[PDB]
């Protein structure tokens, strides 16, 4: 059978890189915003192969009416934010969870923190500090996941691949559960 996994979240959060890094073990060398892309991979769990269908959506608000047309029969959502983008974290509560709830009320989702390799980056810590803000800690991310009311919180880096496979392994388990 086919697992339908839909990835949502603000622009610049890193959804395309997350997916290309995992499905291909290559990091995209360019930034190109998404309207819509559908990729497929095959995964095997306990001897049983599954097609994992991965829906890469646009985080730009311009696609608010169109994006959800892709949400029917979703098995699991990845609701993404960048651990170094507080505005993307706020929109999880304000835009993204409300959106996927409305369309798919009984579908499980994971809260996914992206770009964790940038937490200890001096010059992104600087960019944040010029507007008196700071990265999101796991402690804070995990409260939001509990409260909002996700399967769990996972985080990763598409660039280093730290925790990346785990994100999708938990997505797969959520869909099959």
């Amino acid at each position: 059978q086919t697992i339908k996994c839909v990835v949502v979240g603000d622009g610049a959060v890193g959804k395309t890189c997350l997916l290309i890094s995992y499905t291909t073990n290559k990091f995209p060398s360019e930034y190109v915003p998404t309207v819509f892309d559908n990729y497929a991979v095959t995964v095997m769990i306990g001897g049983e192969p599954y097609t994992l269908g991965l829906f890469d959506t646009a985080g730009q608000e311009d696609y608010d009416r169109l994006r959800p047309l892709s949400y029917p029969q979703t098995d699991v959502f990845l609701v993404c934010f960048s651990v170094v983008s507080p505005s993307s974290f706020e929109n999880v509560k304000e835009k993204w969870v409300p959106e996927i709830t409305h369309h798919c009320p009984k579908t499980p989702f994971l809260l996914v923190g992206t770009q964790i390799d940038l937490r200890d980056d001096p010059s992104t810590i600087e960019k944040l500090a010029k507007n008196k803000q700071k990265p999101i800690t796991p402690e804070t991310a995990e409260k939001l996941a509990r409260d909002l009311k996700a399967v769990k919180y996972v985080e990763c880096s598409a660039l280093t691949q730290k925790g990346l496979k785990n994100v999708f392994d938990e997505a797969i388990l959520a869909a099959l559960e």
Binding site: T23, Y39, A40
Partner: protein
């Protein structure tokens, strides 16, 4: 355990085509909204 993913396929790629001035490579359910 769960295997690493295999047999990567890029099935749909939607873009806006400025020469034609319309989205191209659309999912079918978007198509009957936009075309």
């Amino acid at each position: 355990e769960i295997s690493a993913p295999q047999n990567f396929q890029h099935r749909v790629h939607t873009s806006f085509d400025p020469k034609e001035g319309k989205f191209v490579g659309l999912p079918p359910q978007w198509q009957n909204i936009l075309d």
